[PDB]
C-alpha cells in the first residue's frame, strides 16, 4: 500500500492487539476486500525466548483445530523473520466491551452465548498441546452475536479495549499449586456473571480488597437474578479448587442444560 503491508493475498492494515512473540493486524484479503485478523509473530523474539520448538507445535496444532465457536486460521505463511497466521475477523469485538458499553444481556441470552464458550473451552481443554490458562479478554463476539473465542497460547495477541486488571482465580493469586482446567472454571464464572449483572463479580482499584474478595470469595447475586443460576454462579466462584464445578457439573446444571445442542458436547 503505502508500503511493503502486503503478503500472500492480503494487505495489513491497523494494529488490533500485542502480545509477547509480536501483534496482530486487521488485514483484508486484497481481491475481495474481505476481512481477516493477521498475527505476525517476530521470530527473532521468538529465537531469543527460546521457544521456537514450542511456537512451532502450537501453530501445527492450531491448524487443525476446527469449532464453531473458536477463531479459525485459514493460512499461515512464514517468512525469515515473521510467521504471519491469517486468522477469521469477527465483527463484534471483545465481550466484555460489548457488556460494558451495552450492560448486561438478557437471561436466555446469556445463556445462549455461556453454552457456547464453555463448548469452547471443554475443545481447548481436550486439544490444546499444552494446557494454558484461558483469558477471558479472548472471548469476542461475531457478526451474529455468537461467541468466538481467540487462541490464547504463547501466540495470544489479545490487546486493550475499554475501561470498568489484576485478576486471577483464588488459589492462583494465593500463590497455591494449581490445576489450569480448576481455574477455567471460575474464569468461566466471571463471564457468566459479567453477562448476566453486567458487572465484574469482584470490582476494586485497591489491590488488597480486590484479593481479599476474591480469596473471601463474597460476591453480589443481584434481586432480578433466579436461584437456579445463582447456584451455578456459587459453584463455579467456589474459591476452594476441591469444591469448583467441574464441566461436567456445569453440563448437569438444570440452569444450563435447558435448550443445548448436543454437538457442542460430543461423547
Ligand atoms: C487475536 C485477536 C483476533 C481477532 C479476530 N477478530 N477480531 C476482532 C477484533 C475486534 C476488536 C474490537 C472491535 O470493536 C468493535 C466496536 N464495538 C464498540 C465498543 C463495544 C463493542 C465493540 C471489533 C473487532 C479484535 N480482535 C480480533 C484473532 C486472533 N487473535
Same mark, same amino acid.
Not at 43 to 55: C, E, H, P
Given at each position: ?40 509473530? =517476530?521470530? #527473532?523474539?521468538?529465537?531469543? &525466548? ?13 491448524? &487443525? ?9 485459514? #493460512? ?38 455461556? #453454552? #457456547? ?16 490458562? &484461558?483469558?477471558?479478554? =479472548? ?9 468466538? @473465542?481467540?487462541? *490464547? ?12 486488571? =489484576? ?17 477455567? @472454571? ?13 458487572? &465484574? ?12 474478595? @476474591? ?10 437474578? =433466579? ?19 467441574? @464441566? ?7 440452569? *444450563? ?11
Amino acid at each position: 500500500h503505502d508500503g511493503r503491508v502486503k503478503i500472500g493475498h492480503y494487505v495489513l492494515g491497523d494494529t488490533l492487539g500485542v502480545g509477547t512473540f509480536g501483534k496482530v493486524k486487521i488485514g483484508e484479503h486484497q481481491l475481495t476486500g474481505h476481512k481477516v485478523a493477521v498475527k505476525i509473530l =517476530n521470530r #527473532q523474539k521468538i529465537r531469543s &525466548l527460546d521457544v521456537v520448538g514450542k511456537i512451532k507445535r502450537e501453530i501445527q496444532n492450531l491448524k &487443525l483445530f476446527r469449532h464453531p465457536h473458536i477463531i479459525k486460521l485459514y #493460512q499461515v505463511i512464514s517468512t525469515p523473520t515473521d510467521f504471519f497466521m491469517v486468522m477469521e475477523y469477527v465483527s463484534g469485538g471483545e465481550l466484555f466491551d460489548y457488556i460494558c458499553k451495552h450492560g448486561r444481556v438478557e437471561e436466555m441470552e446469556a445463556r445462549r452465548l455461556f #453454552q #457456547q464458550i464453555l463448548s469452547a473451552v471443554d475443545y481447548c481443554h481436550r486439544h490444546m498441546v499444552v494446557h494454558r490458562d &484461558l483469558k477471558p479478554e =479472548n472471548v469476542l463476539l461475531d457478526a451474529h452475536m455468537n461467541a468466538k @473465542i481467540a487462541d *490464547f497460547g504463547l501466540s495470544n495477541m489479545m490487546s486493550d479495549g475499554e475501561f470498568l486488571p =489484576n485478576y486471577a482465580a483464588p488459589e492462583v493469586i494465593s500463590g497455591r499449586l494449581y490445576a489450569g482446567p480448576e481455574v477455567d @472454571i471460575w474464569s468461566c464464572g466471571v463471564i457468566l456473571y459479567a453477562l448476566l449483572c453486567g458487572t &465484574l463479580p469482584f470490582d476494586d482499584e485497591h489491590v488488597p480488597t480486590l484479593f481479599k474478595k @476474591i480469596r473471601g470469595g463474597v460476591f453480589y447475586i443481584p434481586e432480578y437474578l =433466579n436461584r437456579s443460576v445463582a447456584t451455578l454462579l456459587m459453584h463455579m466462584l467456589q474459591v476452594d479448587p476441591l469444591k469448583r464445578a467441574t @464441566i461436567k457439573d456445569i453440563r448437569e446444571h438444570e440452569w *444450563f442444560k435447558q435448550d443445548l445442542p448436543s454437538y457442542l458436547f460430543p461423547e
